[PDB]
Amino acid sequence: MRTFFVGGNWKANPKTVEEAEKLIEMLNGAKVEGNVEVVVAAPFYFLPTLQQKLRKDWKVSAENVFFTGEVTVPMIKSFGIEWTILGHSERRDILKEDDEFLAAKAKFALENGMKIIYCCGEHLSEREAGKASEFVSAQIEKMIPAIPAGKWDDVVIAYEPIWAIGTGKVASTQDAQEMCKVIRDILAAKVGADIANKVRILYGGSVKPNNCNELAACPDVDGFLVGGASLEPGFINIVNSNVHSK
Amino acid sequence: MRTFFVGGNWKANPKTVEEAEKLIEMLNGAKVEGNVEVVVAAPFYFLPTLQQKLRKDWKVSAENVFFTGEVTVPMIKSFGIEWTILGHSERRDILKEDDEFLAAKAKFALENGMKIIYCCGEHLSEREAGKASEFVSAQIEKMIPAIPAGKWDDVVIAYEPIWAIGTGKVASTQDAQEMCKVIRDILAAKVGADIANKVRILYGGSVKPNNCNELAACPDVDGFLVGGASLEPGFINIVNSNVHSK
Ligand code: NA
Ligand code: NA
């Protein structure tokens, strides 16, 4: 039985420390139902505030980790931050973060006691070419050798349908399920069923209060990496969709 | 009379918040001599600590400013952080931060009430080709049109001899003076003598307690952007080299 997992990615939000404090006060009062592991990723400047004020049953995450302008594992590790996102689509696409680089980063983060939300997902061209499975499989196949023995408990994988983000195309609930299953099957083929059965695989497309319950019920969807809704009152609805996941 | 300026760039240091707190306690006790404007740039995670604990006669700076993983002007602006470094050689070279991008960033930062330490400097090939002046002039010539009317009081320019960083070549005191003068002359040619006479131009090569006094005395050198020494007790010696600058 895999514990449902919801990560809230604030991205470059909110605008001020006062707004971050108000968001934290609201999350601290949220009534969680069911069984669910919740992590909140926030800009670097705000992590100290989160680590001090956020409900201790939830954990704080970096949105990325690393010279001038860059932030490192010991600093966040030394702050008591245990999680990072890696390979988020925005960073892959906009900043050309590549797979060798990213699998290398996962290896390094895990070797240093970090837990990771490792993002993957295909673009519109590969989806339209009928190569979505092939592309995503390749991404995970590059990730797999980077995971140290004994560290699979510290890995969560997030599927981002990049083909449906800013393109004029939308993903269905079935699309989410199918691509999460693709991921689980490649894990099973390469590292075995015990690993495949315990790794949480998340849907990282558009998740809102109006589609979370339907998505949660999908058998290979173990949770969400949430964007904009993480800043809104409906984040708790998404956390609580775990009750629909068998 | 331009006020001498020393910026300390901690880069990706120190390793822990406790070490940052100890460094701040040491800087807070430092006896400043002469007249000098001091700014300390630190990793994002540490800026809240600096803004709260660092001596209020000094100002805190971001090492850079901006999606997932990125940090923005309102957040730092909203924290009361008034300075950023822009165009640091490490970010230009390693991450391909280009001139149009960087002049665009300066325009945007200044339009939003930020003061900037704008970095320039040539690589070994252009230095060896006899094109150092030409290359640096071009960089500043791209920067100039980006500065809004009335904002030149909020700009400091740092010359980084990239050709002497990690290459096996060292820069002389005369090299620093000449390239700072190159910068001042291009300002004079393009935007006039009043602007050229008030803009602080800094040396951003290797600055230590053993060469700061000699460098400070150079007539077109108005201060320093300090790397590794900013983390060490000799940073105060560098701040106090202003007494040698006429
Ligand atoms: Na499910
Ligand atoms: Na001088």
Q: Taking CB atoms and an 8 Å cutoff, what residues of chain B touch A46?
A: 75
How far apart (Å, rounded) are the C-alpha atoms in residues A197 and A40?
A: 24
Write down the H helix ranges in A29-69: 47-53
Mutation target vs B (from A75, A92, A93; most B CBs, 10 A cutoff): A75
Which residues pair with residue A230 across a beta bridge? none
Nearest Cα to A111, choosing from A58, A62, A147, A137? A147
End-to-end distance of chain B based on CA atoms, in angstroms? 9
> Can you read off the two tokens belonging to residue A134?
């092939």
Nearest Cα to B6, choosing from B233, B196, B230, B179? B230
Ligand nearest to the CA of A241: 1
Mark yes or no for CB contact B11/A64 under 8 Å. Answer: no
Task: Kindly state which CATH superfamily the domain B1-246 is placed in.
Answer: Aldolase class I (3.20.20.70)
Domain boundaries along the sequence of chain B: 1-246
Q: How many CB pairs under 8 A join A and B?
A: 104
8-state DSSP, A218: S
How far apart (Å, rounded) are the C-alpha atoms in residues A173 and A245?
A: 14
The beta-carbon neighbor of A71 closest among B43, B72, B78 is: B43
A120, A88 Cβ separation under 8 angstroms = no
Among B37, B63, B88, B122, the active-site one is B88
> Can you read off the two tokens belonging to residue B126?
């252009």
> Can you read off the two tokens belonging to residue B97?
């931060």
> Can you read off the two tokens belonging to residue B60?
């805190």
Q: How many CB atoms lie within 10 A of CB B96?
A: 10
How far apart (Å, rounded) are the C-alpha atoms in residues A70 and A16?
A: 21
Nearest Cα to B211, choosing from B197, B229, B193? B229
Which residues pair with residue B4 across a beta bridge? B36
> Which element (helix H / strand E) includes A159?
strand A155-159
> Which element (helix H / strand E) includes A36?
strand A36-41
Nearest Cα to B26, choosing from B239, B238, B233? B233
B214, B27 Cβ separation under 8 angstroms = no
How far apart (Å, rounded) are the C-alpha atoms in residues B81 and B61?
A: 6
AA identity, residue A100: E
Is B21 catalytic? The answer is no
* Residue B42 near chain A (CB below 8 Å): no
| Residue A51 vs residues A59, A74, A100: alpha-carbon distances, Å | 8, 15, 31
Nearest Cα to B1, choosing from B200, B154, B143, B233? B200
b/e sequence B208-232, b meaning 16+ C-beta within 10 Å:
ebebbbebbebebbbbbbbbebbbb
Nearest Cα to B157, choosing from B124, B131, B191, B208? B191
Which residues pair with residue B60 across a beta bridge? B40
How far apart (Å, rounded) are the C-alpha atoms in residues B25 and B47?
A: 15
> Which element (helix H / strand E) includes B39?
strand B36-41
> Can you read off the two tokens belonging to residue A109?
């983060």
Total residues belonging to chain B:
246
Mark yes or no for CB contact A71/B11 under 8 Å. Answer: no
